[PDB]
Design a protein around this ligand. Structure first.
Ligand SMILES: Nc1nc2c(ncn2[C@@H]2O[C@H](COP(=O)(O)OP(=O)(O)O)[C@@H](O)[C@H]2O)c(=O)[nH]1
Ligand code: ALF
Ligand SMILES: [K+]
Ligand SMILES: [Mg+2]
Lengths: 51, 409, 102, 52, 51
């Protein structure tokens, strides 16, 4: 089990394929949305360097 | 006697510490607890030491508000967006500049003579563009472009390096295409620096084909239309409409693609390519007088209708193309006997004018995205939390590890 | 008249349908011989009238395609590979009566 | 909303985050983290066998 | 100024808590309540009186 779990720990595709519970995917989307908000504001903050 | 495995593994684990605890305690707990903290504080120092050297190449530190990596901020935002959501639900709200025109037109020429003539496969004989190719252009020295966002170290002024770089893009172009078509929406990310490059993102969408010949898979033209939605459904997209110059406007597909996107031309500029083919056939100056006035094109594109011309040889260097373009436009009756002054026609005016319109749209619309994404998160968190009150914060890495421990337990 | 399929310059929107009717009056003739005039200053991927003869003459019994501006194949203005394939006929989504150079 | 656990959880989470960014943790950002570089250098000194 | 940079920033937590509490009382009891300061209430009462 330890050998297999370590293989799964490295096997991202199976982890994605196995972990499809619709809440972690929503949680993953929320993280991406949060990252984009930072990335959106970072560029927008860079636009505001004019004044 | 009831169980012996637990005793053995625990006893050997206790032996491992007695001999090596003086090294394991430092590595296993002390280092790891500090490891995360030093990432924020001490890696900061090493990042800044190199970053400052990189900024000096950018000149951002030397000059206030002027930095070549400043435009790279724009691309970083889109790269996350494409990874987060590559579908129309998000892509349709992302500002961009697209190259739209007949496939025959050689529409990509508007970008080839800037940086891409050296690293992008071109020439006649076959359809070249297979999927949207986005090029991040930035004022700077010659520097090998990023290929699929991958670092490269090549000399952009020597053929041996450029030929290998042309191969790299071609591999992405064809690999993006699957059976049943010849075109794919999967995009290719390029970021190049060099002289004459403007700060903007220009995307060479695959050329539209009126009819799907037997030399192309049946779904080629339908797929291009769907890919054309990158601008047809994008109020933040700027469209460069390319008329194949040798043939007349009523025949061309691009007329309908853009006029259904913005019939007022507010989101587009009309550009003509291969105008010099007017003098390799019986030229019509009166037809060119209708071209500049947009009587010939229904999208009523705004701005000066720039024209791109070239020798037609697929080996002409960027510098050779620029010199050929200036001499031809300043003397050809196509523009000298009509109201198309060469200094407005020249491609370098389009690049500046496109860069001017690029930042106009980006600053105006980008702030709307911040409110949209924030509203999205609140609506998603409200429903997600209500249906899953237990998990206020979850990640697929946290989900796996809990199972990993749970299974072992 | 040549097919436009889109109306520009203030022209009445009915022009493309009128053109198609004028041309189908003959292209729908079972015994007619159809000569498709192809602009050779463009790649083969741009062909406005192929789709019509491919429906009115899918059997290659009337339609002959002729390539204009053949000098642009010499100059590489138009893709030579697609020109060779249209000469051989690999690019037609239909049977064709023949092919000639203009 | 009345007599609903979800509202209590949301209020608790907001207050907890505000406390997490409060002065209690703000001070540590200016008194502990900036010496993690010295801690890392001391870790490097400890792993070297010269002292042993 | 060191104390300034160290401590002034966290005064935002209590400001946000106060705004949250006031807006919470409003949402629960005064969803129509706005920045009804010395001017707005006076104007509304004046208009009602005149009508
Ligand atoms: N005559 C002429 N040829 C051009 C022009 N721009 C590009 N070309 C030719 O078109 C070929 C490839 O250009 P490209 O931009 O890649 O067009 P595409 O491959 O059809 O998308 C090269 O052989 C170029 O010489 C132009 O403005 N005038
Ligand atoms: F000829 Al193209 F994209 F314009 F393949
Ligand atoms: K072409
Ligand atoms: Mg191309």
């Amino acid at each position: 089990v330890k050998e297999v779990l370590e293989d799964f720990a490295e096997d991202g595709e199976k982890k994605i394929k196995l972990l499809t519970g619709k809440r972690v995917q929503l949680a993953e989307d929320l993280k991406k949305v949060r990252e984009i908000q930072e990335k959106l504001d970072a560029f927008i903050e860079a636009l505001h360097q004019e004044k | 006697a009831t169980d012996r495995g637990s005793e053995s593994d625990k006893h050997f684990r206790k032996v491992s510490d007695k001999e090596k605890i003086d090294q394991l305690q430092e590595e296993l707990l002390h280092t790891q607890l500090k490891y995360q903290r030093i990432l924020e504080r001490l890696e900061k120092e090493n990042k800044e030491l190199r970053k400052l050297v990189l900024q000096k190449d950018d000149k951002g530190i030397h000059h206030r508000k002027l930095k070549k990596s400043l435009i790279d901020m724009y691309s970083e935002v889109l790269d996350v967006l494409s990874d987060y959501d590559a579908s129309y639900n998000t892509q349709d709200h992302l500002p961009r500049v697209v190259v739209v025109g007949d496939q025959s037109a050689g529409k990509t020429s508007v970008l080839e003579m800037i940086a891409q003539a050296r690293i992008f496969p071109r020439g006649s004989g076959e359809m070249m563009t297979r999927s949207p190719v986005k090029v991040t252009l930035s004022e700077g020295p010659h520097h090998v472009a990023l290929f699929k966002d991958s670092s490269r170290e090549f000399d952009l002024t020597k053929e041996e390096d450029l030929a290998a770089l042309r191969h790299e893009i071609e591999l992405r172009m064809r690999k993006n295409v699957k059976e049943g078509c010849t075109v794919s929406p999967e995009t290719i990310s390029l970021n190049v620096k060099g002289p004459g490059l403007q700060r903007m993102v220009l995307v060479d969408l695959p050329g539209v084909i009126n009819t799907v010949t037997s030399g192309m898979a049946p779904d080629t033209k339908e797929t291009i239309f769907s890919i054309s939605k990158a601008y047809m459904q994008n109020p933040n997209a700027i469209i460069l409409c390319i008329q194949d110059g040798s043939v007349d406007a009523e025949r061309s597909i691009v007329t309908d693609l853009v006029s259904q996107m913005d019939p007022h031309g507010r989101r587009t500029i009309f550009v003509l390519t291969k105008v010099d083919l007017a003098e390799k056939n019986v030229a019509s100056p009166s037809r060119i007088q209708q071209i500049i006035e947009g009587k010939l094109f229904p999208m009523k594109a705004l701005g000066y209708f720039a024209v791109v011309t070239g020798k037609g040889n697929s080996s002409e260097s960027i510098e050779a193309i620029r010199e050929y373009e200036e001499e031809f436009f300043q003397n050809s009756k196509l523009l000298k006997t009509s109201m198309l002054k060469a200094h407005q026609v020249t491609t370098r005016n389009l690049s500046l004018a496109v860069s001017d319109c690029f930042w106009k749209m980006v600053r105006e619309s980008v702030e709307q995205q911040a409110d949209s994404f924030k509203a999205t998160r609140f609506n998603l968190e409200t429903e997600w939390k209500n249906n899953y009150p237990r998990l206020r914060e979850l990640d697929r890495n946290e989900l796996f590890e809990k199972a990993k421990n749970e299974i072992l337990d």
